[PDB]
Amino acid sequence: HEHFLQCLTTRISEPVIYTHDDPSYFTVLNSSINNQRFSSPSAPKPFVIITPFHASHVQATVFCSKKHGMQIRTRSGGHDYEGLSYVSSVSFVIIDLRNLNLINVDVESKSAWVQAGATIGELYYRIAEKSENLAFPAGDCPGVGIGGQIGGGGYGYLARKYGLAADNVLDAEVIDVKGRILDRKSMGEDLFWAIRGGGPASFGIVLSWKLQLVPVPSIVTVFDVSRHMEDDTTKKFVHQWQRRADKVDEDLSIYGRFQTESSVDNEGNKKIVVRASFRATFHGGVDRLLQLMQKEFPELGLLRQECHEMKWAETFLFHNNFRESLDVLLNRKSSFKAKSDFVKKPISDDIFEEMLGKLYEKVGNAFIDLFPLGGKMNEISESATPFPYRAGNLYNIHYLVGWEEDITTSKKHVNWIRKLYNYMTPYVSKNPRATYLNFRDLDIGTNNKTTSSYNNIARASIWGTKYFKDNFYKLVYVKTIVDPTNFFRNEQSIPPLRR
Ligand SMILES: *Cc1cc2c(nc3c(=O)[nH]c(=O)nc-3n2C[C@H](O)[C@H](O)[C@H](O)COP(=O)(O)OP(=O)(O)OC[C@H]2O[C@@H](n3cnc4c(N)ncnc43)[C@H](O)[C@@H]2O)c(*)c1C
């Protein structure tokens, strides 16, 4: 290891390098660990953490890590569901891109250059600073890094209108295994295809994205309402949501969320209730929204007083529960296990109720979310990016169980969510069991940790066709061309073919 440090110190003439002895190391490590499952002192720790300010800091780290057999994990926002950006089973270093967060918005060309350590929140602020009529389709969690979110797709309220973030990328700059800086034209269309939704950690290190900005009106409308599950109107609305939320006007995206809570009846007897919440952004005015809901979802009974008009960028305040705050908050804590599925056929009302009934074992700390697809998603080819789940997909269902990290509670929580996943098997898509890469899940399979490349590819196709369906085979080809020695690897990285 000492040679590796001398290599770095010689190539990075300097705070860029943080060692175990440096007192800021643990602060910089824990700073962007966002699933506390992996913050334990027993979790594996990086030998060093690099916080580059320049692309040559990354170039030096790649050279030295290759020369001395260190594994790199790239970290942008640190939101990886399985912590793959900051844990490894081998000796590793973290390249943490937090300092490469510069953003250049150009209104006349409707485009922005964005360094890959910028957060979603930072990007939205920088857009609003220059124009209330421009946006970019991405998630709504403002702490998420642009590097990983675009890297695996990037879904949100504008997806039904404009597609995934990965569908709205014009150019990019990447470092490959040979230390070269490439952009779209010099890297080729195949690698430019692979990094937009295929998990860039398999192929190199993305340094920046060139984004295509999209039009939005000056005023949009939001709501976040609760409804009573025992009312027939609520049950019809969920029935109708399953059949219609992917088919309504592309300006409207309605999410659903379900959870249980502890309550009491009128007599004071303890009772568990299911709470149903529906939250939405309509890219339009409130009167048009209300006419639309009466036409398509009258059973929700949406009230004018539940709707709120604002500028597009303020919806991320509302949807993150900043409901006085300035946009500047976008410039600024638990352990969880999550899983997810794609649904191609409406789940019958009785099975949906049995699925909700599993929440009675996990009161207050488990959530089922429903995200609608269709719209623009149906018009985009399944091989336009590595994300393949377009036409034929009605919605994504997302399961989550959370807890506070304090010791067998963890195993009981993970066990519960697996059985719910196993219960859903017959009613969700299959062959492959479609999975959204940005909801990473190691349970669906991991790589060999050395056998032949044939066996590596056969094993990796278990998880690989779940994330990518048929696009997995093109991904293996790109990996074979651009990283034949398999330097950039992790528990779920595309393997190359060898001779
Ligand atoms: C925690 C969290 C995640 C969310 C949230 N909301 C989302 C939403 O509304 N829509 C979505 O589509 N996804 C949402 N997600 C999930 C995130 O999209 C994914 O979890 C992202 O992968 C997270 O990105 P990032 O914050 O950058 O996480 P990292 O752990 O740093 O990276 C993930 C993954 O990608 C590799 N990688 C990152 N950056 C690079 C670069 N520049 N080059 C190469 N490889 C890179 C990492 O190595 C890792 O493997 C809401 C919340 C609260």
Residue 75 has phi, psi (to 5 degrees) of: -125, 130
Measured CA to CA, the distance from residue 63 to residue 12 in angstroms comes to 11
Q: Same domain for 338 and 487?
A: no
Q: Is residue 381 part of a domain?
A: yes
Considering 96, 113, 144, which residue would you say is the last residue of a domain? 96
Ligand 1 atom nearest 81 alpha carbon: 20
For ligand 1, atom 34, the nearest C-alpha belongs to 148
Q: Is residue 226 part of a domain?
A: no
Q: Is residue 225 part of a domain?
A: no
Q: How many structural domains is the chain composed of?
A: 4
**What residues have CB less than 8 Å from 12, skipping those under 6 apart?**
50, 57, 60, 61
Measured CA to CA, the distance from residue 82 to residue 34 in angstroms comes to 10
Q: What is the DSSP letter of 119?
A: B
Whichever domain contains 52, its CATH number is: 3.30.43.10
Instruction: Report resolution (Å) to 1 decimal.
Output: 2.2
Q: Is residue 222 part of a domain?
A: no
Q: Same domain for 252 and 394?
A: yes
Q: Is residue 303 part of a domain?
A: no
Q: Same domain for 114 and 35?
A: no
Tokens read off for 133: 């009529």
Considering 368, 400, 427, which residue would you say is the last residue of a domain? 427
Residue 337 has phi, psi (to 5 degrees) of: -130, 130
Task: Decide: 149 and 120 in contact? Cβ < 8 Å.
Answer: yes
Q: Same domain for 182 and 158?
A: yes
Q: Same domain for 123 and 207?
A: yes
In angstroms and rounded to an integer, the radius of gyration of the C-alpha atoms of the chain is 23
- Residue 109: how many CA atoms within 13 Å on its side-chain side? 10
Measured CA to CA, the distance from residue 196 to residue 176 in angstroms comes to 15
Q: Same domain for 263 and 395?
A: yes
Q: Give the domain extent around 496.
A: 445-499
Task: Decide: 78 and 30 in contact? Cβ < 8 Å.
Answer: no
Q: Which of 436, 350, 425 is nearest to 393 (CA)?
A: 436
Q: Same domain for 250 and 385?
A: yes
Is 253's C-beta closer than 6 angstroms to any atom of ligand 1? no
Q: Same domain for 390 and 458?
A: no
Considering 46, 75, 96, which residue would you say is the last residue of a domain? 96
Distance 150 CA to ligand 1 centre (A): 8
Beta-strand pair 169-175/181-182: antiparallel
Cα distances (angstroms) measured from residue 19 to each of 13, 25, 60 = 16, 6, 17
Ligand 1 atom nearest 86 alpha carbon: 30
Measured CA to CA, the distance from residue 214 to residue 74 in angstroms comes to 29
Is 216's C-beta closer than 6 angstroms to any atom of ligand 1? no
Is 148's C-beta closer than 6 angstroms to any atom of ligand 1? yes
Is 139's C-beta closer than 6 angstroms to any atom of ligand 1? yes
For 254-322, the DSSP string reads: EEEEEEEEEEE-TT--EEEEEEEEEEEEESS-HHHHHHHHHHH-GGG---GGG-EEE-GGGHHHHTTT-
* Apex 402 CA angle, 87 and 327, nearest 5: 85
Q: Same domain for 476 and 364?
A: no
Whichever domain contains 151, its CATH number is: 3.30.465.10
Q: Same domain for 44 and 182?
A: no
Q: Same domain for 342 and 408?
A: yes
Measured CA to CA, the distance from residue 148 to residue 160 in angstroms comes to 21
* Location of structure tokens 């010791």: 407
Measured CA to CA, the distance from residue 136 to residue 128 in angstroms comes to 11
Residues followed by a break in the chain (C to N exceeding 2.5 Å) are 14, 323, 332, 406, 449
Whichever domain contains 412, its CATH number is: 3.40.462.20
Q: Is residue 61 part of a domain?
A: yes
Q: Same domain for 392 and 272?
A: yes
Q: Which of 346, 159, 341, 345 is nearest to 240 (CA)?
A: 346
Is 421's C-beta closer than 6 angstroms to any atom of ligand 1? no
Is 201's C-beta closer than 6 angstroms to any atom of ligand 1? yes
Q: Is residue 437 part of a domain?
A: no
Measured CA to CA, the distance from residue 193 to residue 386 in angstroms comes to 7
For residue 428, the tally of other CB atoms under 10 A from its CB is: 19
Method used to obtain the model: X-ray
